[PDB]
Design a protein around this ligand. Sequence first.
Ligand SMILES: Nc1ncnc2c1ncn2[C@@H]1O[C@H](COP(=O)(O)OP(=O)(O)O)[C@@H](O)[C@H]1O
Ligand SMILES: Nc1ncnc2c1ncn2[C@@H]1O[C@H](COP(=O)(O)OP(=O)(O)O)[C@@H](O)[C@H]1O
Ligand SMILES: N[C@@H]1CON=C1OP(=O)(O)O
Ligand SMILES: N[C@@H]1CON=C1OP(=O)(O)O
Ligand SMILES: [K+]
Ligand SMILES: [K+]
Ligand SMILES: [Mg+2]
Ligand SMILES: [Mg+2]
Ligand SMILES: [Mg+2]
Ligand SMILES: [Mg+2]
Lengths: 305, 321
Amino acid sequence: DKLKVAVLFGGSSEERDVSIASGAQVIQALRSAGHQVLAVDTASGLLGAEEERGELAGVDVFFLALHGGTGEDGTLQALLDAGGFAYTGSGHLASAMAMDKDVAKRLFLAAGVETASWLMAPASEEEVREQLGFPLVVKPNSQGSTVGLSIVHSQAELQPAIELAGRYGDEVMLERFVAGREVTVGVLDDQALPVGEILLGGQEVFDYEHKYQAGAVREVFPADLPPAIAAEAQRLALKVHRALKLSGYSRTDFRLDEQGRLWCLEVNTLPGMTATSLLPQAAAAAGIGFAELCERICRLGIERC
Amino acid sequence: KLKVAVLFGGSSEERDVSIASGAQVIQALRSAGHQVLAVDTASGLLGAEEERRLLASKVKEVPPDSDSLAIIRGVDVFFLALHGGTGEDGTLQALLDAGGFAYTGSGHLASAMAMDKDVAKRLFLAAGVETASWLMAPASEEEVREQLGFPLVVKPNSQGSTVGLSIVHSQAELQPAIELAGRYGDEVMLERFVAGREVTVGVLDDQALPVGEILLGGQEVFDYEHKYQAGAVREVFPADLPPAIAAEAQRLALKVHRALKLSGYSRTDFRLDEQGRLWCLEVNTLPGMTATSLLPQAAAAAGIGFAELCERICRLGIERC
Ligand SMILES: Nc1ncnc2c1ncn2[C@@H]1O[C@H](COP(=O)(O)OP(=O)(O)O)[C@@H](O)[C@H]1O
Ligand SMILES: Nc1ncnc2c1ncn2[C@@H]1O[C@H](COP(=O)(O)OP(=O)(O)O)[C@@H](O)[C@H]1O
Ligand SMILES: N[C@@H]1CON=C1OP(=O)(O)O
Ligand SMILES: N[C@@H]1CON=C1OP(=O)(O)O
Ligand SMILES: [K+]
Ligand SMILES: [K+]
Ligand SMILES: [Mg+2]
Ligand SMILES: [Mg+2]
Ligand SMILES: [Mg+2]
Ligand SMILES: [Mg+2]
């Protein structure tokens, strides 16, 4: 039968605007399926009639429409664990691991999932030149939505990029740049969804502004890939999902180089659920509408907790 | 002087060990001139009468049974004298993060990884630290014979104090050991048994402490009774090891401590086989501070008294948070 769902969204991370967009979509979708939905901005509280345009007693599950920060890195998950509350997405350890890109890439390698060489800042000019080369990617260790990320083409560009990434967290990653195509794989309850490609044109990376403006980039589900490469991307994403002990759903990002080899960048335990977002498009390609997707995520969270 | 809240007790199978650790830490910090509040996380901030009775309780031969645990279930720094469960697996750490409180030991990711022995061992190998072959239940008897063979160790993935652990010498013993380990958590490890010597390395503030050896006599493993009954086993600090082996154990323990992003202090356990190879079992982020505990003995061997050790752990927590 129908659920009472509290959709937690907003928060105080650099991905707050993305989270508000996700929360708005999920609230409408679950209401469309006849569930009772309570909208909670975790930076303010329970929204009234106008703001949407005690009561949480009897809530079956908290839908975590949050992105980044304490909402995605395990902190909120542990808070809800300690309160005995059911929630969607991955648990405390799994969420904390997937947000730490450094730790996650060590586990990718342990699972047989290819990933680009990297160093954590600070790194000397010698270490960078010997192990990484140019161009390279500087990114915060625990951000999302491409926040804080720079492409570094020469040694003189490195320090400003590290300082930029350092404004968004305590650790900074220097990663070998993988030239090629942009591929992403959603997982829903231990099943891979159709692979998607993001067509970047002349751009080096998939940045914040192109991730969340409608029509800024073309996104193709199922991607126009040789069947064996798409099957490999799905095989690897499931290995990542299982390796980090994720639950419910996830979305894994790959770079596909000009030689046909896939390189795993990261996995996201709370991927975007907006209109332009990648995971809903992969689900729709699999035949799963957005409302059904939201309900299934709810029930997977209930079963786990 | 500081104002310290010592959190202890909890509702894990290591509750009695935690009470014993908290009692020592509270006593030592009060001797050093600090104001100390005692907090059993199973109830709350204790009054003097409930403090007096709780802290006098000694660790028993067996851990607190499930039925007993069912009934149980201006501060400068929170000293976490807890062991296991939510007190050590990152849950409480995240609680304290969210409240902006300073606490001792490792953060919430680091604590969660060290309690998950499976994940920790993957990171051991990533850091160049040897560790024994292992499988996670469910594993077919076919897989077990092919990968591990006998003897092997069955242990809960996320316990401590040797709770739920069995040595399996034959096929018939395997299923009962897995059922036992499953009464103490959701995940169960099967690990190749390493015959040899029992070696442990404390770390304090990114420095290794003198290596210790636990002399087990004829016992194959270091169990709950022998860990906490006084005089049950002889423990040697600094261990009587070839210097190159002790120095390698210390190098590896520091690699483990840094690999899992631990903070403050830790204690890493190894088995040393007859060929001189070290095999890393686990690292503990909230090691015991009881009167029979290993970390205080390593600290003492480095010239660090117990009260000073407690104070230094406090200040490392304040500086981190
Ligand atoms: N090593 C790399 N090589 C090439 N492009 C990269 C690399 N790392 C990141 N990028 C680009 O930056 C984007 C964001 O990187 P990602 O690692 O997915 O972090 P985020 O969590 O911010 O999405 C990717 O979608 C990709 O376009
Ligand atoms: N693979 C193994 N080989 C030999 N002895 C083991 C092994 N694993 C555990 N033990 C024994 O069991 C004890 C507890 O195991 P450990 O991995 O340290 O778990 P705990 O977190 O319960 O201390 C060890 O001190 C050791 O005596
Ligand atoms: N974390 C963002 C927001 O929702 N989905 C995301 O994926 P990412 O941009 O991290 O690749
Ligand atoms: N976890 C226990 C209690 O404090 N220190 C301990 O180490 P372990 O027995 O886990 O090796
Ligand atoms: K991530
Ligand atoms: K441990
Ligand atoms: Mg991400
Ligand atoms: Mg990404
Ligand atoms: Mg342990
Ligand atoms: Mg141990």
